[PDB]
Design a protein around this ligand. Structure first.
Ligand SMILES: *[C@@H]1O[C@H](CO)[C@@H](O[C@@H]2O[C@H](CO)[C@@H](O[C@@H]3O[C@H](CO[C@H]4O[C@H](CO)[C@@H](O)[C@H](O)[C@@H]4O)[C@@H](O)[C@H](O)[C@@H]3O)[C@H](O)[C@H]2NC(C)=O)[C@H](O)[C@H]1NC(C)=O
Ligand SMILES: *[C@@H]1O[C@H](CO)[C@@H](O[C@@H]2O[C@H](CO)[C@@H](O)[C@H](O)[C@H]2NC(C)=O)[C@H](O)[C@H]1NC(C)=O
Ligand SMILES: *[C@@H]1O[C@H](CO)[C@@H](O)[C@H](O)[C@H]1NC(C)=O
Ligand SMILES: *[C@@H]1O[C@H](CO)[C@@H](O)[C@H](O)[C@H]1NC(C)=O
Ligand SMILES: *[C@@H]1O[C@H](CO)[C@@H](O)[C@H](O)[C@H]1NC(C)=O
Ligand SMILES: *[C@@H]1O[C@H](CO)[C@@H](O)[C@H](O)[C@H]1NC(C)=O
Ligand SMILES: *[C@@H]1O[C@H](CO)[C@@H](O)[C@H](O)[C@H]1NC(C)=O
Lengths: 728, 295, 49, 49
């Protein structure tokens, strides 16, 4: 006999003129009751009333569509009403809004222009759902170097998901880069710089080796360089490579020496081949007292007398530690009703685990203190049995910490990197808790993980019911994507952990991946446990460049082919990678797209709204305890399920026991036909049902690499951001 | 601000007393803005440490003061809406506004320490704020009101002054006519109107005596209760009647017979609520320009 | 040599709470207030963990 | 106040930036009124002596 318990995964950010999702559920006896989620403004009134009806074990999680709102920012009630036959329940909240924006990027034709040229440029439009987006813009302009609007077009009907215009540049070179800015009707300005410069290219560049990380025990370092020219051609030449220590001992505020030791290194490189050089540290003074370390290089040539330079590793900084170890699979939560365990990766210095380094696993306030050593990967898989205090620190260290390896340090410090953690067990008074075992590693895509999670019934079932099921989740995107469930009948008093779940990672999933699973009791008790999963960006909509290779018959009939659908358009970009070779790129990637994403994670809560308050503390709470033991009623601070809600950013509404009954304190207180370069093609394109059947203007002997930007947009599916490829 | 309301409704006012009063108004407002919360409460608080709290009854008072501020001067609606979300957060699982004690001195609060009474006062204040009689907040409030109402009616005793006064006030502003004629009957039976003598109280000895000498912590709410009920008494949207308004005039006579005129009183609660009474009664009893007549 | 040490504060249920002491004389005292002693298998001293 | 003059003369202004600016205006004004003199000056003063 179970009281109807109901629980909802419903995000507390209501948007404007879009669609997102939230989930719901019920159980326990009787399901012939209606529920109703009435989203209403906290001030005024904006009617968005959701009535719902279903049965138990039915979490129908569907994407809602929100219309536009009135104001800029405000929170809004959501009274959910639960009508028992013996009782009546309701609960409201404050669902907060967020002024959203379409998302943008401008695609730069080049970064070098001469007097009289014309810049070509594209844009992006998109929302949280990465279906392509068509919108007006009241505000566009390129900018001068002095802060002056340039290239305006007002409230334009972008139909293709992104418009590209051009702007004619001056025959009066006012030298400097430029900028664009944009805002929509709401008027939020956003900007996209782009280098626009000019000078003759140094026709080659230097490519050099160096140690990556630097640390304490250091005597000699490496250098190696090879000659280069256009098309990847070899070169002989000469060098004079000043490489220096800095930050002389003085106050060096221009009254004194600021340049510390300089060390120049010269040599010669063969015609075809390379040349090596070796350098040291003591002559540079790897001194304990210094500021950062700059490591720059240079090369001169033969038969014309020209130099090319590289500035490398401007702060090869030695650590105030010596190792580079860390955790790999480290948790913050556990229970005394579970012996938890994990793994740690030892690495020293540069990024190298070497075996044969015995160490000490040190669990304080666990009464657990074991040793281990380094495998070939320096990995150790500790394990802790646990019937110990609420919160505890965790550390595993090679060097003994009686006295702080370097003997006290009442002065400057230097130690082994000590991988330290503090985890707090989970509050579970029944101890029938929900446990999961995340696989925290290099996460793959196109897979389905066998995460073994464990289900504990301490106290078991007394009157209750037999049939039991749980609802695990397959979610990403900073929202709610996909879900599942597991069903397992209950014995009286068995609490086995032997359970695994399938969690596919195939498609429409972002780098963000957190889930939950939970379990409800009819005694007025429910239990849930979430975990985050460091998913990398595996593309959702397929985009994969493929090109007419280095190919003779350089006629225009050279059919590059990127994959795209029968239902899409695509933003195509032939471009020579010349200045973008001269300096490296600038996140010209969907990485930029993903970090562009506002509130990519549905986590957090603004300052003003805090939480809904409840009444749980006891009025007269003194010891009142006798029998085999005598003990006060003091406290404990630990995580709640309420805290899992505030973690996830979703809210929920139940008549059950979640918010722990924390007591309340007293007030007693503390002729050749050459063709134009660097753009064979510039045009949005409609993919046929077989990708892009291409005939793009091609030419031989352009001894150049040719990035191919192609970024497609499907209505039936969504966006598309391909990796470009060089053409030759 | 409430005497500014008074004088602006009396038709007696000058631009110079106006000027100085605006100065003091802005001064009090900015001083209060110094005392604003991270979350939107108001209290005597050591904030900028996340483990601190606000206040309930105090925050009812600041909300009504901001109401009058909007009624005269500039004031941010984001702040009042912040206060009201904090109100919503401060309610129970299913009950109504508890009493989160973090105050310096409890002398100022004229109440029976009951969450339901706190809820009643804040919710009728919010009834002055523009929203419906069926808002979820006023709705749960009304639930608490009805519970208190039954406990008071069929209970022989209900604190005999305070809870019943605020309840008559609340259900009066809800839209209840004849039930408030009923509480009128109950209270006029619990009256000391005399044919040839003016006075208004019972023998004044409390049931739960604290101190027993001078009645510490108890303002006694002598004119305060009668003023509350009279405030409820005057109100009728289209037009109040003749019986209610003439009885209102004569009890205004009796209560001004029971009030003084030195300027200010021994407290602030009975003061501000008597000021409410005088202001709106003067606005109601007469016009502002009709000044020529031979009766 | 008796000990009832539980490492955690270790009280389950509605409240989590540590151990603590009492202030009251015991049957083991009721020889001390006699002043004499004895040796026993019964359980007389308080369970001081 | 001088940027309020600026925006009120630019024709660029909004009622919300206006609202907040009025708040800060009144705040600075009342804070200055705290710092008024017996005689009508203004300074960093230890007056009432
Ligand atoms: C910490 O990590 C270490 C890495 O393996 C572990 O070190 C082990 O320590 C034990 C200590 O006994 C070594 O055992 C050896 O036993 C033989 C036989 O001696 C016997 O008599 C002596 C003296 O009474 C007694 O101490 C021994 O237990 C034996 O009963 C001796 O000849 C050796 O000198 C040494 O004592 C292990 O060989 C050693 N393993 C190594 C060196 O790899 C250690 O187990 C870890 N911590 C723990 C759990 O102890
Ligand atoms: C409460 O909500 C109603 C309904 O939205 C508001 O009444 C108007 O309703 C129309 C649609 O029929 C909206 O387009 C208007 O924006 C609403 N305002 C107008 C013009 O009256 C009502 O105003 C709201 N009351 C508030 C804000 O408290
Ligand atoms: C509630 O559950 C009981 C059985 O315990 C059932 O008899 C009753 O019909 C249920 N309520 C409704 C509206 O069905
Ligand atoms: C190290 O230095 C030598 C000579 O400078 C060179 O041959 C070698 O390639 C450099 N790098 C490594 C990893 O040995
Ligand atoms: C962990 O070790 C303890 C003894 O310290 C033992 O009682 C417990 O069963 C162990 N846990 C498991 C299940 O291995
Ligand atoms: C003063 O009274 C007049 C009516 O005589 C009213 O219109 C005005 O709003 C009042 N002043 C206020 C409330 O600032
Ligand atoms: C703002 O400008 C208008 C003219 O456009 C002027 O009349 C008004 O006085 C200005 N606002 C001020 C000074 O408060």
């Amino acid at each position: 006999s179970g009281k109807p318990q109901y629980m909802v995964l419903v995000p507390s950010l209501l948007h404007t003129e879009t669609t997102e999702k939230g989930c719901v559920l019920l159980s326990y006896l009787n399901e012939t009751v209606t529920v109703s989620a009435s989203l209403e403004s906290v001030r005024g009134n904006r009617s968005l009333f959701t009535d719902l009806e279903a049965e138990n074990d039915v979490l129908h999680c569907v994407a809602f569509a929100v219309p536009k709102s009135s104001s800029n920012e405000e929170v809004m009630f959501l009274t959910v009403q639960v009508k028992g036959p013996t009782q009546e329940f309701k609960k409201r909240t404050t669902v907060m809004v967020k002024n959203e924006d379409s998302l943008v990027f401008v695609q730069t034709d080049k970064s070098i222009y001469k007097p009289g040229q014309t810049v070509k440029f594209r844009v992006v439009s998109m929302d949280e759902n990465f279906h392509p987006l068509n919108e007006l813009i009241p505000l566009v302009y390129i900018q001068d170097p002095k802060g002056n609007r340039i290239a305006q077009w007002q409230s334009f009907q972008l139909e293709g998901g992104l418009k590209q215009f051009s702007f004619p540049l001056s025959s009066e070179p006012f030298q400097g880069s430029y900028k664009v800015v944009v805002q929509k009707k709401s008027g939020g300005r956003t900007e996209h710089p782009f280098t626009v410069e000019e000078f003759v290219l140094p026709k080659f560049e230097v490519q050099v080796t160096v140690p990556k990380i630097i640390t304490i025990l250091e005597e000699e370092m490496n250098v190696s360089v090879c000659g280069l020219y256009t098309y990847g051609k070899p070169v002989p030449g000469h060098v004079t490579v000043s490489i220096c220590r800095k930050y002389s001992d003085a106050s060096d505020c221009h009254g004194e020496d600021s340049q510390a030791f300089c060390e120049k290194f010269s040599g010669q490189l063969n015609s075809h081949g390379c040349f090596y050089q070796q350098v040291k540290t003591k002559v540079f003074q790897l001194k304990r007292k210094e500021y950062e370390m700059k490591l720059h290089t240079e090369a001169q040539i033969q038969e014309e007398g020209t130099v090319v330079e590289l500035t490398g590793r401007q702060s090869s900084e030695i650590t105030r530690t010596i190792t580079k170890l860390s955790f790999v699979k480290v948790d913050s939560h556990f229970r005394q009703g579970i012996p938890f365990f994990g793994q740690v990766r030892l690495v020293d210095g540069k990024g190298v685990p070497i075996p044969n380094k015995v160490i000490f696993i040190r669990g304080n306030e666990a009464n657990y203190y074991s040793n281990a050593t380094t495998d070939e990967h320096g990995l150790v898989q500790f394990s802790i049995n646990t019937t110990n205090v609420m919160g505890t620190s965790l550390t595993v260290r090679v060097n003994y910490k009686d006295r702080s390896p370097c003997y006290g340090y009442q002065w400057v410090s230097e130690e082994h990197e000590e991988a330290h953690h503090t985890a707090y067990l989970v509050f579970s008074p029944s101890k029938s808790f929900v446990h999961l075992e995340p696989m925290s590693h290099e996460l793959p895509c196109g897979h389905t993980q066998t995460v073994q999670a464990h289900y504990i019934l301490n106290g078991g079932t007394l009157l209750g019911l037999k049939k039991l099921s749980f609802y695990y989740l397959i979610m990403a995107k900073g929202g709610i994507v996909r879900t599942g469930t597991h069903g397992l009948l209950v014995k009286q008093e068995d609490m086995k952990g032997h359970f695994s779940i399938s969690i596919p990672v195939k498609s429409d999933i972002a780098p963000v991946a957190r889930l939950l699973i939970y379990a409800v009791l009819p005694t007025g008790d429910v239990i849930g446990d979430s975990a985050k999963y460091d998913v990398e960006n595996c593309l959702a909509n397929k985009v994969d460049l493929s090109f007419s290779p280095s190919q003779s018959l350089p006629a225009s009939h050279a059919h590059l082919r990127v994959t795209a659908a029968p239902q899409s358009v695509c933003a195509l970009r032939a471009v020579d990678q010349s200045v973008l070779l001269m300096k490296p790129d600038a996140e010209l990637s969907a990485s930029s797209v993903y970090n562009l994403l506002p509130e990519k994670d549905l986590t957090g809560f603004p300052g003003p709204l805090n939480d809904q308050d409840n009444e749980d503390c006891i009025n007269r709470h003194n010891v009142y305890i006798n029998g085999i033991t005598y003990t006060p009623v003091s406290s404990t601070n630990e995580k709640d399920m309420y805290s899992f809600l505030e973690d996830m950013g979703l809210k929920a509404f139940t008549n059950s026991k979640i918010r722990k009954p924390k007591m309340c304190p007293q007030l007693q207180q503390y002729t050749v036909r050459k063709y134009f370069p660097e753009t064979w093609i510039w045009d949005l394109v409609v993919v046929n049902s077989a990708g892009v059947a291409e005939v793009g203007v091609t030419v031989p002997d352009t001894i150049t690499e040719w990035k191919a930007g192609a970024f497609c947009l499907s209505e039936d599916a969504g966006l598309g951001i391909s990796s470009t490829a060089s053409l030759r | 601000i409430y005497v500014l309301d008074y004088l602006n409704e009396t038709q007696q006012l000058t631009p110079e007393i106006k000027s100085k009063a605006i100065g003091y108004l802005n001064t009090g407002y900015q001083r209060q803005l110094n005392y604003k919360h991270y979350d939107g409460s108001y209290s005597t608080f050591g904030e900028r440490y996340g483990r601190n709290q606000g206040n309930t009854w105090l925050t009812a008072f600041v909300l009504k003061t901001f109401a009058q501020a909007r009624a005269y001067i500039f004031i941010d609606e984001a702040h009042i809406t912040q206060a009201l979300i904090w109100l919503s957060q401060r309610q129970k699982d299913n009950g109504c506004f508890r009493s989160s004690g973090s105050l310096l001195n409890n002398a100022i609060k004229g109440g029976v320490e009951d969450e339901v009474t706190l809820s009643a006062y804040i919710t009728i204040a919010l009834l002055e704020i523009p929203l419906t009689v069926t808002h979820p907040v006023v709705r749960n409030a009304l639930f608490c009101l009805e519970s208190a109402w039954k406990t008071a009616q069929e209970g022989d005793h209900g604190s005999h002054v305070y809870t019943k006064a605020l309840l008559a006030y609340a259900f009066a502003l809800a839209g209840n006519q004849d039930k408030r004629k009923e509480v009128l009957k109950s209270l006029n039976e619990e009256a000391v109107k005399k044919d040839n003598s003016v006075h208004w109280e019972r023998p004044q000895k409390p049931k739960a005596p604290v101190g027993h000498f001078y009645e510490p912590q108890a303002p006694s709410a002598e004119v305060e209760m009668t003023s509350y009920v009279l405030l409820a008494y005057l109100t009728a949207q289209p037009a109040p009647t003749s019986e209610d308004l003439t009885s209102a005039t004569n009890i205004v006579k009796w209560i001004t017979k029971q009030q003084n005129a030195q300027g200010g009183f021994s407290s602030t609660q009975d003061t501000v609520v008597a000021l409410h009474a005088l202001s709106k009664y003067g606005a109601a009893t007469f016009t502002r320009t009709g000044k020529a007549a031979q009766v």
